[PDB]
Amino acid sequence: MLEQCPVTKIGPWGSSHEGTVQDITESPKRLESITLYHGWSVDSISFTYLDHAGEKHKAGPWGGPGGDPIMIEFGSSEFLKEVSGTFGPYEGSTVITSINFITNKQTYGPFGRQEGTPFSVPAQNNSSIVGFFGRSGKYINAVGVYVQPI
Amino acid sequence: QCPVTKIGPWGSSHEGTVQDITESPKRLESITLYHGWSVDSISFTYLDHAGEKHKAGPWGGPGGDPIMIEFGSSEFLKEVSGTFGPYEGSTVITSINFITNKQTYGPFGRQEGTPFSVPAQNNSSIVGFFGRSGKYINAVGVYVQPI
């Protein structure tokens, strides 16, 4: 139905310009899973999506090698409604310090440490977050979203 | 057809009453706002997907210096950003800023508090607003239309 609609790219949030640019080269239509490595920090993000041609891809990891993973598997009627968190300085760079994933079914997080400036990306009504882009190094410097009608 | 993406709002989750538009927005024609201690009020005119034009607002209250923005025929709004914070017991939108594909308007208001931003990429366009308001503008979000 709405899976054919074009996606909207919005963001990123966090560091204005630090880190290696990370993005995807197909248009995401469905978010299948996220793997986030975390502890006291938000270490890396990965995610699997279906594109608008129905092909599956895994992006990431974007970030460094620390932390322990959580894998969030989207249920068949589960969609991502909001990403939120905090960002702030660490060792001379601005990093995402905490992150939180709010679906229509559950909240996963917060992961990392709730310190610095808050950010939030809420998709309303007929909108869901289907993929990410951003900048990273040892941690995640900035993150943005792709948003699709559902 | 395809619903327009709706993102936000940022600011108070509970103050004011909900403000929103009733049609699917396709093109943003103009914005009027007033600014002083905060973004006191906002209105905007948009074209919907049936070709009707609508003026939304004013959302907010009296006071402040007026600003009127009329978009060029091939000008579109790429980013809205601002701040929210406390004013006389309320959480309000303290400042707002607009970046089009041709120029920047703002910032308007007092850049105090928590920042927010909607940088619309890939030639998408911010085509309308929603939020919460009463005496002040307590929260704001946007509608984004992809190319």
Author numbering:
A (entry chain B): 157 to 306
B (entry chain A): 160 to 306
Authors' text:
A protein involved in resistance against different pathogen groups, which is only present in monocot plants, is referred to as monocot chimeric jacalin (MCJ).
The JRL domain has a β-prism-I fold composed of three four-stranded antiparallel β-sheets. Two of these sheets are canonical Greek key motifs, whereas in the third case the very N- and C-terminal segments of the protein join to form the outer and inner pair of strands, respectively. The dimer itself features C2 symmetry with constituent chains being more similar in crystal form 1 of the OsJAC1-JRL domain (Cα RMS distance 0.58 Å) than in JRL-cf2 (Cα RMS distance 1.13 Å). As indicated by PISA analysis, the extensive interface involving both hydrophobic and polar interactions buries more than 800 Å2 of solvent-accessible surface area on either protomer and is classified as stable in solution. Overall, the intimate interaction between subunits suggests a physiologically relevant mode of dimerization; accordingly, the disulfide bond may not just represent an artefact of crystallization under non-reducing conditions but may actually occur in the full-length protein (see Discussion section). Intriguingly, the hemagglutination activity of the separated JRL domain decreased up to 8-fold under reducing assay conditions (4 mM DTT). These observations suggest that, in contrast to full-length OsJAC1 and the DIR domain, the JRL domain relies on dimerization via the inter-subunit disulfide bond to achieve optimal hemagglutination activity.
